[PDB]
Ligand binder design. Structure first.
Ligand SMILES: *[O-]C1=C(C2=[C][C]=[C][C]=[C]2)[C]=C(O[C])[C]=C1C1=[C]C2=[C]C(C([N])=[N+])=[C][C]=C2[N]1
Ligand SMILES: [Ca+2]
Ligand SMILES: [Cl-]
Length: 223
């Protein structure tokens, strides 16, 4: 997260870190045995880490659970990143409390102007790599579709939305991929891509979760 602030230990209880010997992506806990992340974060050997703040220190509240299976959306396209969403089932259920909790799925899509919270342990520099130890947060608005399409002409599908600041300076970045975009207490987006990080006129692009709620529900229901 570039231009963000320190969230504070466990203030974002649904945030998870996907780890394969190091943190490579974020994710959101939607129920005690399922996490939602981005399809481009897929790999084998994933350990889901819940209740984290400082990812390099065990401080208490952490639950490390291995992934039992990862379900990348069948229509995921790695070239366009359309349908960039993945579900991970946990080997055992997590213990939920106030430090580890699930986030609700939306009932409706959000509208431009809605203010959301984006979090993660991704890079904090737009020009260079600086990865933090603790979780960073950023409050950003969802942009209108015209502004999004005008910034990324021909690359935005109906399963994507832009959120951020056209003036540059504040944005999500690599290491944040797979994590949450929560608005009014509902998971509305998944950190997916962008051109560089925090560049002017190049907002972040997120997977539009409201378009996948029935898919998520049906898939969990059958696995
Ligand atoms: O997400 C990501 C990855 C990545 C690939 C495969 C597994 C995990 C992570 C790699 C990468 O370097 C090639 C860059 C990203 C990445 C860039 C970026 C930018 C923005 C933005 N500008 N808002 C958001 C998210 C990401 N992810
Ligand atoms: Ca820790
Ligand atoms: Cl277009």
């Amino acid at each position: 997260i570039v231009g963000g602030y320190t969230c504070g230990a466990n203030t974002v209880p649904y945030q998870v870190s996907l780890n394969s010997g190091y943190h490579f992506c974020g994710g959101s806990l939607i129920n005690s045995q399922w996490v939602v992340s981005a399809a481009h974060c897929y790999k084998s050997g994933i350990q889901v880490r819940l209740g984290e703040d400082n990812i390099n220190v065990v401080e208490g509240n952490e639950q490390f659970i291995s992934a039992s299976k990862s379900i990348v959306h069948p229509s995921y396209n790695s070239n366009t990143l359309n349908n960039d969403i993945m579900l991970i089932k946990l080997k055992s259920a997590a213990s939920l409390n106030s430090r580890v909790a699930s986030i609700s799925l939306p009932t409706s899509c959000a509208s431009a102007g809605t203010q959301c919270l984006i979090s993660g342990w991704g890079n904090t520099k737009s020009s260079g790599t600086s990865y933090p130890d603790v979780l960073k947060c950023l409050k950003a608005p969802i942009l209108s579709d015209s502004s999004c399409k005008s910034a990324y002409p021909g690359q935005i599908t109906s399963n994507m939305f832009c959120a951020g600041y056209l003036e540059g300076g504040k944005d999500s970045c690599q290491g944040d991929s797979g994590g949450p975009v929560v608005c009014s207490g509902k998971l509305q987006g998944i950190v997916s891509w962008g051109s560089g990080c925090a560049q002017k006129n190049k907002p972040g692009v997120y997977t539009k979760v409201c378009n996948y709620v029935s898919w998520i529900k049906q898939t969990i229901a059958s696995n």
